[PDB]
Amino acid sequence: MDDVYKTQPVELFYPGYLESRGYRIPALETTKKGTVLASIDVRNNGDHDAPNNNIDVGIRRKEVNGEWEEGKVILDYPGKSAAIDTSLMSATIEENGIEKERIFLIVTHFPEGYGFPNTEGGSGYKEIDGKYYFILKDAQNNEYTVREDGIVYNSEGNETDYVMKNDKTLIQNGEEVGNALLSNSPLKAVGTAHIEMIYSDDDGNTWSEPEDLNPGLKKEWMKFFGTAPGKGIQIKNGEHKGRLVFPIYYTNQNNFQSSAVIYSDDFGETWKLGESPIDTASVSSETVSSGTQLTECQVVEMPNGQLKLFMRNTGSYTRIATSFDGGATWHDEVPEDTSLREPYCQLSVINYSGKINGKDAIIFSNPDASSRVNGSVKVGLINENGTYDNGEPRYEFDWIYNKTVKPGSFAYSCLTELPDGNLGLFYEGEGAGRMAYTEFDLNYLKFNA
Ligand SMILES: CC(=O)N[C@H]1[C@H]([C@H](O)[C@H](O)CO)O[C@@](O)(C(=O)O)C[C@@H]1O
Ligand SMILES: [Cl-]
Ligand SMILES: [Cl-]
């Protein structure tokens, strides 16, 4: 205790804050300017997942040597159309002679009446030539496409008297007749999972309008397709320096869940979908229908740029996948780590910028139990141990520290490194829909009660 740092937990979001009855799914990221960003599900109708819940994106900022600022809703869809599970990423690009910083946020989006349990398949788009067009359905399940200037075309390629604005509002004869995201609209969007993206150029003050990442990225055979909540990373070393890496997961036609990442090499302008660790020489994540499912995940980078994907799964212990091509593919051996008991809950893992006992290190946090209790933060030392049959080296984890930071209820959490080398933790567990945040140092993790 004598030399340890640990702040008493504070509530950043709670029932009633921003008029919301519920809050869930914490995400935490630090900017290059030292600002801490805390995004959350603004679950206005209660703690339940989609569907039947008006969920929005909220965020709070804490600049270096400053207080937590007021929370703001930065993405809000009509009715009970949900924006659920957010992920944050601070990333930079060498501009003219200025290294400029942009903050990325991706979130899963459902139209009204839909969520993970009842999602349909498809991207929500139809491809004509090389252009993807937003699909709309009438009550008779006929198909329409939104094209130039928002004009709605029918299945025969002829124009209707409908226009859809970018916020999915439907105009007919100069009158607003509905919104494509609502259960009561004459023309509805496909009831399927989207990943939407927003970005901020001013250290998190203001955010762009959502950009749908589905077209050309989500496979038509996918049903669920959504953000793995927490954070993404920008690769710092190796062949793929600068690549943005965002953990996601999806389901195929058998509703089997598979983890993956989407990545960008043009600073978020375009995105590509990498393989799942489910995808091997033997197994295809498109057609698999049995075995261990891999769902929510987080990614950390090795000293040479090698990627490690930590995955929530239907097994007892955390699964870790290894990528040699910046997340495009994963080594076909995906082992457990018997030091990371995994009771089917989201986890957090991050890179640590400084050496710990002369080694590069990562930090891990999850409920270390057979249920969502005993929130524990672990420190992993990185050790080389030979190379692969290929040329790339082999990294292993030494879990030296394993500190309980929440003996009672503990669910979703997200770590981040503070500008001073300390650690922040945005976690569920304090009860009554309260989203808690605490700070501590490495000595707090070394202490063994
Ligand atoms: C999009 C969505 O629904 N995400 C939710 C996930 C998924 O439902 C599961 O990963 C699917 O198996 O699970 C939670 O319910 C949970 O267990 O805390 C909360 C989270 O918001
Ligand atoms: Cl302890
Ligand atoms: Cl509760």
Ligand nearest 411 Cα, by number?
1
Please state the φ and ψ torsions of residue 17, each to the nearest 5 degrees. Answer: -65, 130
Beta carbon of 25 within 6 Å of any ligand 1 atom: yes
Q: Which residue CA neighbors atom 8 of ligand 1 most closely?
A: 116
- Residues paired with residue 310 on neighbouring β-strands, in sequence order: 298, 320
Beta carbon of 84 within 6 Å of any ligand 1 atom: yes
Query: Among residues 357, 230, 355, 233, which one has the least CA distance to residue 306?
Result: 233
Query: Residue with structure tokens 């910028």?
Result: 353
Mutate which of 57, 87, 116, 372 for ligand 1? The one with the most ligand atoms within 8 Å of its CB, which is 116
Question: Can you tell me the distance from the alpha carbon of 220 to that of 78, in angstroms, rounded to the nearest whole number?
Answer: 26
Q: Which residue CA neighbors atom 15 of ligand 1 most closely?
A: 49
Query: Among residues 247, 249, 188, which one has the least CA distance to residue 222?
Result: 249
Q: How determined?
A: X-ray
The CA 86 to ligand 1 mean position distance, Å, reads 12
Cα of first residue to Cα of last residue in the chain, in angstroms, is 9
Could you tell me if 404 and 426 are in contact, meaning their C-beta atoms sit under 8 angstroms apart?
no
- Catalytic: 296? yes
Peptide bond into 393 cis (omega under 30): no
Q: Domain map of the chain by residue range?
A: 10-121+194-446, 125-189
Question: Can you tell me the distance from the alpha carbon of 64 to that of 78, in angstroms, rounded to the nearest whole number?
Answer: 35
Beta carbon of 285 within 6 Å of any ligand 1 atom: no
Tokens for 114?
A: 């839909």
Ligand nearest 119 Cα, by number?
1
DSSP H or E run through 289: none
- Catalytic: 412? yes
Query: Residue with structure tokens 């709670």?
Result: 14
Query: Among residues 409, 413, 444, 441, which one has the least CA distance to residue 426?
Result: 413
Query: Among residues 182, 151, 186, which one has the least CA distance to residue 165?
Result: 151
Tokens for 226?
A: 């959504």
Residues 6+ apart with CB under 8 A from 35: 61, 62, 63, 64, 203, 204
Could you tell me if 330 and 324 are in contact, meaning their C-beta atoms sit under 8 angstroms apart?
no
Query: Among residues 445, 249, 276, which one has the least CA distance to residue 364?
Result: 445
Mutate which of 24, 39, 47, 49 for ligand 1? The one with the most ligand atoms within 8 Å of its CB, which is 49
Could you tell me if 147 and 160 are in contact, meaning their C-beta atoms sit under 8 angstroms apart?
no
Could you tell me if 163 and 174 are in contact, meaning their C-beta atoms sit under 8 angstroms apart?
no
Tokens for 393?
A: 């080296």
Ligand nearest 257 Cα, by number?
1
Ligand nearest 46 Cα, by number?
3
Please give the CATH topology (third level) of the domain spanning 10-121+194-446.
Neuraminidase (2.120.10)
Q: Which residue CA neighbors atom 1 of ligand 1 most closely?
A: 116
Q: Which residue CA neighbors atom 19 of ligand 1 most closely?
A: 49
For domain 125-189, give the CATH number.
2.40.220.10
**What is the position in ligand 1's atom list of the atom closest to the CA of 224?**
1
The CA 403 to ligand 2 mean position distance, Å, reads 5
Determine the length of the chain.
449
Strand order in the sheet with 72-75: 22-30, 36-43, 55-62, 72-75
3-state secondary structure of 128: strand
Residues 6+ apart with CB under 8 A from 183: 79, 111, 112, 113
The residue annotated as part of the active site, out of 17, 29, 41, 49, is: 49
Torsion sign (Cα): 15, 21, 26, 28: negative
The CA 387 to ligand 1 mean position distance, Å, reads 37
The residue annotated as part of the active site, out of 412, 427, 437, 444, is: 412
Beta carbon of 226 within 6 Å of any ligand 1 atom: yes
